[PDB]
Write a protein that binds this ligand. Structure first.
Ligand SMILES: NC(=O)c1ccc[n+]([C@@H]2O[C@H](COP(=O)([O-])OP(=O)(O)OC[C@H]3O[C@@H](n4cnc5c(N)ncnc54)[C@H](O)[C@@H]3O)[C@@H](O)[C@H]2O)c1
Ligand SMILES: NC(=O)c1ccc[n+]([C@@H]2O[C@H](COP(=O)([O-])OP(=O)(O)OC[C@H]3O[C@@H](n4cnc5c(N)ncnc54)[C@H](O)[C@@H]3O)[C@@H](O)[C@H]2O)c1
Ligand SMILES: N=C(N)NCCCCN
Ligand SMILES: N=C(N)NCCCCN
Lengths: 474, 474
């Protein structure tokens, strides 16, 4: 009695079958009507092939590359009888090139990252600015300007980026009620941005604490994570990056901006997974997060930008990731950065290996009259196993967001290139919420200046606790 | 058939019965002749009392304080018939005051730290320099200038500080031998300092990797360590501190020297357990260490100082701790600094709780013709259980160093106030080595500039890989 939202008439082309593909396929089978034979999975690994064969789904063992993607994908996307859906959950592939190929062939598209073709993340000829997620996102915004409207393609619709955009909207609604701000619920981007401004939201952390842990301890010289190791390391070695709020009075000496684009970002000349920030979640209370670049750090700040008539930004929230991954991933980062090179091996924790834990993932809106408000999911591994197969709690928050994005795309298939900020947050959360466990809002009086200054002189701004100057760990 | 080294002809007063007192008591019983009733343990803890009652030893459940130490310890240490031994393995007590009391009453003395009376480490009216181990050590040096000679008192004779001073001497001898330099090894402090100078030793890391882990995972809001939690947190919140070599050409903007004293130190205006350095051990290979202040960072640099006729330092090595504690302690530090406060609870891992692991503890001499040489112990928990009770591998390296210092003090009882750098390193290692497991010397071509620069600008000195500029994580 799981809801079947729609029938999909055309081919369903899943690119990538790692941790998220494995968790998303069963949700697609559960929630859409289609002949199983219309699915096709593309992945270069033998591991993926054997799992796909165990599920009786068509499999092509190929890496999608710049050289082959047109000849490989166009026949799959256009096999008919109707509109196909490209579900892209891969690494090492260009999200922009594949999305544009889907659109010109009339196929819907969804992904969870603006990924580049293999070679980009470690290309020594690129300036740091060009390796930023701001720069990658700007290629998507340029593609939209060049071809407005047309077939829907949903960029960056996982848990974060993705779901957390919908949490920001729900949190703004809750804050407005709790603070007594009158007005109808916003229905346009400008109205959302004005509501954040009117509420006095100085900034937003994507504030996450993963407490899953395995039945075995972290092995030496093995990177351990609850989702893509390759993907986490790639974003962790990109510059630290944030949407930059109009309220900020200070940035570090090694911070840089952008000469062009939407104007909402800065980045630091240091890797994000070795950059710490002071943050807070309900279960962690005060904790360090890593300032890992994410698409939504830019997209949320951009979405909530208010401009004057000259086009100058007069309000924008700071927005960035404050990630505390699982303990073995924390150790894995200490080992990787401490050695100066990637470990020899890695592994992604399977639900059969996880003893207990939750993936606490939400948004921390701060600077308003009630100081700080966290809104999000506290999904446990135990609940995950009861309600969805083949994934851990991290995976289910992502796969269920892809499901919601797919439902929205089928119901709005002529919307052009869109981000999660552009979707109907209420419909998406209606689809996703059965998979999120406890979803709660919590206020706190904690601030980044709690307990400070201490035994040593610190470079703090005592006038405003939430300044990045107080959040960033030097 | 354990060797019995000496008769102790007077009371043995053990102050403190935590992890190190528990590991040292069986070695004292094993290796010294004395009537059982001569030994008494002083500790305020109920847990300690119960264990001592179980070991059949006299126990006085009392905190030693500035107000009571004279009335308590003078009668106990002078009970007769001859010279007693104060074995000080406590926290929250003044090493200097207890040492001076023991000496004025003719009792031998040993400790593993220059500890202050309770209140000092977190005193808000103290400048950071006054909280430094350099400053604490200078109180011992002044005591020795005021009362030269007299009864032997051994300051800071644990594993590190303590044993590592003997490892430095052995490593210097080994480096010379490996180069083909033959001849009488040094006998005076000047000759040792000139050996380091002549061999081109630029600096020394106390380079350690603890791999012990427990049968339960790290509990939330519990600090876990393999030795004193209180003591590790105390030194971890003291300023980062190092003996400062003559070859260094850069120091950070928040580094400071000292107006007075032996001249060998700098400190940083930040806590050492939240300061990382690039270092290396044989089992870890390249790793982060924490730059936690330690007595030997200053005492080894001081000992190996060569001065000119005017008294100015012409050569001195850099010397500092590069500590990678057990994984649960790494997580404990991330938790403590990330929350801004000490955890609600703590625990020290017992040998019965430890599944496997070693305490790899040695000295990394660098800058000489063979680049870098690590010399030290790789004692495993499995070997520990075979050879000594009531402790883990970390404890046994410490307790066996205390044993060695006790033998040396009984053999050289008229030497006055001394540090581990002043003892006969061969005799001390002769006593200690049965408890050290594999003791090895390993060369490596690794330097702090391995793999650097990466994809971000870095301030590095490529002319001199081992400069602190390149070691310090910035
Ligand atoms: N919330 C979010 O937005 C979010 C969360 C998790 C993951 N992600 C992203 O989702 C993607 C997948 O994550 P995951 O955990 O499943 O990763 P994963 O590492 O588990 O799996 C990635 C898969 O991609 C395949 N692959 C590699 N090269 C390929 C190519 N050229 N063509 C096709 N497939 C290729 C691999 O063989 C592998 O099976 C990653 O890009 C990741 O960063 C997003
Ligand atoms: N290699 C080294 O040099 C080295 C290594 C380990 C420990 N240390 C030092 O040795 C000492 C003991 O370490 P540990 O692991 O045994 O610590 P621990 O925390 O296990 O035990 C400390 C004990 O001191 C006792 N104590 C507290 N206040 C006291 C007082 N006023 N009088 C007497 N006893 C008191 C406590 O009850 C506790 O039992 C610490 O100072 C530590 O820093 C040195
Ligand atoms: N989300 C933004 N930053 N802008 C609005 C984009 C709307 C695309 N239809
Ligand atoms: N170890 C030194 N730094 N100096 C020599 C001290 C000698 C004490 N008898």
């Amino acid at each position: 009695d799981w809801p079947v939202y729609h029938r999909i008439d055309g081919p369903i082309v899943m690119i990538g079958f790692g941790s998220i593909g494995r968790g998303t396929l069963p949700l697609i089978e559960r929630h859409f009507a289609f002949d199983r034979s219309k699915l096709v999975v593309i992945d270069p690994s033998d591991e993926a092939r054997k799992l796909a064969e165990a599920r009786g789904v068509r499999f092509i063992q190929q890496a999608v590359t710049r050289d082959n993607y047109r000849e490989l994908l166009v026949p799959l996307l256009t096999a008919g009888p109707g509109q196909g859906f490209c579900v892209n959950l891969s690494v090492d592939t260009s999200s922009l090139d594949i999305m544009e190929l889907a659109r010109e062939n009339g196929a819907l598209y969804i992904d969870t990252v603006v990924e580049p073709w293999l070679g980009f993340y470690f290309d020594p000829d690129l300036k740091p600015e060009a390796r930023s997620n701001y720069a990658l996102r700007e290629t998507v915004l340029a593609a939209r300007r060049n071809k407005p409207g047309g077939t829907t393609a949903v960029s960056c619709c996982g848990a974060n980026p993705g779901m957390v955009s919908w949490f920001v909207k729900q949190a703004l609604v809750n804050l407005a009620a709790d603070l007594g701000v009158t007005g109808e619920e916003p229905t346009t981007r400008e109205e959302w941005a004005r509501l954040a401004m009117d509420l006095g939201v100085k900034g937003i952390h994507i504030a996450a604490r993963d407490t899953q842990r395995a039945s075995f301890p972290k092995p030496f010289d093995v990177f351990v994570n609850t989702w893509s190791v390759e993907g986490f390391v790639s974003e962790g070695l990109q510059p630290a990056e944030l949407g930059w709020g109009t309220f900020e009075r200070w940035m570090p000496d090694n911070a840089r901006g952008h000469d062009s684009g939407c104007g909402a970002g800065i980045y630091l000349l240091q890797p994000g997974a070795n950059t710490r920030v002071r943050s807070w979640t309900p279960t962690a209370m005060a904790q360090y997060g890593f300032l890992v670049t994410h698409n939504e750090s830019i997209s949320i700040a951009d979405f909530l930008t208010v401009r004057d008539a000259a086009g100058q930004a007069v309000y924008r929230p700071t927005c960035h990731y404050a990630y505390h991954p699982c303990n073995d991933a924390v150790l894995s980062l200490h080992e990787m950065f401490g050695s100066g090179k990637r470990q020899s091996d890695w592994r992604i924790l399977d639900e059969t290996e996880i003893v207990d834990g939750i993936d606490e993932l939400g948004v921390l809106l701060y600077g308003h009259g009630k100081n700080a408000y966290w809104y999000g999911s506290q999904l446990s591994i135990e609940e995950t196993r009861r309600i969805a197969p083949d994934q851990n709690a991290t995976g289910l928050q992502v796969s269920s967001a892809v499901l919601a994005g797919m439902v929205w795309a089928l119901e709005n298939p002529n919307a052009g290139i869109v981000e999660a900020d552009d979707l109907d947050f209420r419909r998406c959360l209606e689809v996703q919420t059965p998979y999120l466990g406890p979803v709660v809002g919590v206020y706190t009086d904690w601030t980044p200046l709690a307990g400070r200054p201490g035994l040593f002189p610190e470079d703090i701004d005592t006038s405003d606790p939430w300044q990045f100057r107080n959040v960033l760990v030097r």
